[PDB]
């Protein structure tokens, strides 16, 4: 059961590495807010962390300290994800830096989290509309409503401030009021329901979901227009060539790190295995070499970002 805990951390790490790998597939948008030297500082610090973690991975697999082994694996996985985000961000910056490249444009609204809120509010309201809805369900649905309506109104305020489209500016403000007003009206019915859980107050609360659903639905429809969505960067062939050394080095790091974790997973179960210790050393060196090439590639281009 203790080794099973270590194996599970390995499987979690491997899952995260495959997820973060997608950042390197086609960097046509920024990953975060980091500048170029921000990315470089990030990779350097994650290098120190990863180096320490990889020492802990081997040492604790050998000595059979499975709790410390799992922690070293998780630490390594986090550093590798940090590496990849910085590398993918730096590669994007390099690609769009090219004179014949065009940078991406972030949308007025984060695309899916708007549908996420719409769905969460729809299903919260669905619960409030059910004849069998219990008092605890009113409370849980109310927390869902409050969380996502607050987010929706914040996104409306921000989207309105960013857009140059006058119609969109007014619509986002109008939708924010519609959501705020309908939500407040629903919260009013919920408070009355709490003080007196009558059939009238139950029907009143149920009825108050409809104006909220309509507002959130009209808003989701309007905000899903492609005009308001992000535009991917158009990176020139020269930009692609320039960013490729960073990309392939980060890709090679993730691949070799996967082998290292898979090998360590087996060694945690049975460390008495000289062949696998050699395989682990092979993966470790390839991880280290990949990082070296990544830092080298990024340092080569650093003077152009001073």
């Amino acid at each position: 059961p203790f080794t099973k805990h270590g194996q599970k951390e390995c499987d979690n790490a491997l899952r995260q590495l495959e997820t973060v790998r997608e950042l390197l597939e086609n960097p046509v948008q920024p990953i975060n807010d980091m500048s170029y030297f921000g990315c470089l500082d990030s990779v350097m610090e994650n290098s120190k962390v990863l180096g320490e973690a990889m020492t802990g991975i081997s040492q604790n697999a050998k000595n059979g300290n499975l709790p410390e082994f799992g922690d070293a694996i998780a630490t390594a996985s986090k550093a590798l994800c940090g590496f990849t985000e910085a590398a993918a961000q730096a590669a994007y910056l390099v690609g769009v830096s090219d004179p014949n490249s065009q940078a991406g444009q972030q949308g007025l609204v984060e695309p899916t989290q708007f549908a996420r809120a719409n769905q969460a509010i729809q299903m919260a309201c669905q619960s409030l509309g059910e004849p069998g809805c219990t008092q605890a369900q009113v409370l849980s649905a109310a927390t869902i409503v409050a969380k996502h309506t607050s987010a929706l109104c914040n996104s409306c305020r921000l989207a309105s401030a960013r857009t140059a489209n006058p119609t969109a500016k007014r619509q986002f403000v109008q939708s924010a009021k519609e959501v705020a007003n309908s939500t407040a009206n629903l919260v009013k019915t919920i408070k009355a329901l709490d003080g007196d859980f009558t059939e009238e107050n139950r029907a009143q609360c149920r009825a108050a979901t409809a104006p909220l659903l309509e507002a959130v639905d009209n808003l989701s429809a309007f905000a899903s227009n492609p005009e308001f969505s992000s535009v991917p960067a158009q990176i020139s062939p020269e930009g692609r060539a320039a960013m490729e050394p960073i990309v392939i080095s980060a890709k090679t790091m993730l691949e070799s790190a996967g082998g290292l974790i898979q090998t360590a997973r087996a060694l945690a179960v049975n460390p008495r295995d000289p062949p696998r210790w050699s395989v682990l050393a092979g993966h470790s060196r390839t991880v280290s070499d990949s990082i070296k090439k990544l830092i080298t590639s990024m340092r080569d281009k650093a003077p152009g970002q001073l």
Binding site: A142, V145, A146, T183, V187
Partner: peptide, 17 residues
Amino acid sequence: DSEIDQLFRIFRALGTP
């Protein structure tokens, strides 16, 4: 009107990580 805003803020706190 203000008790509703207070209740709403309680609801948001209970449903936010």
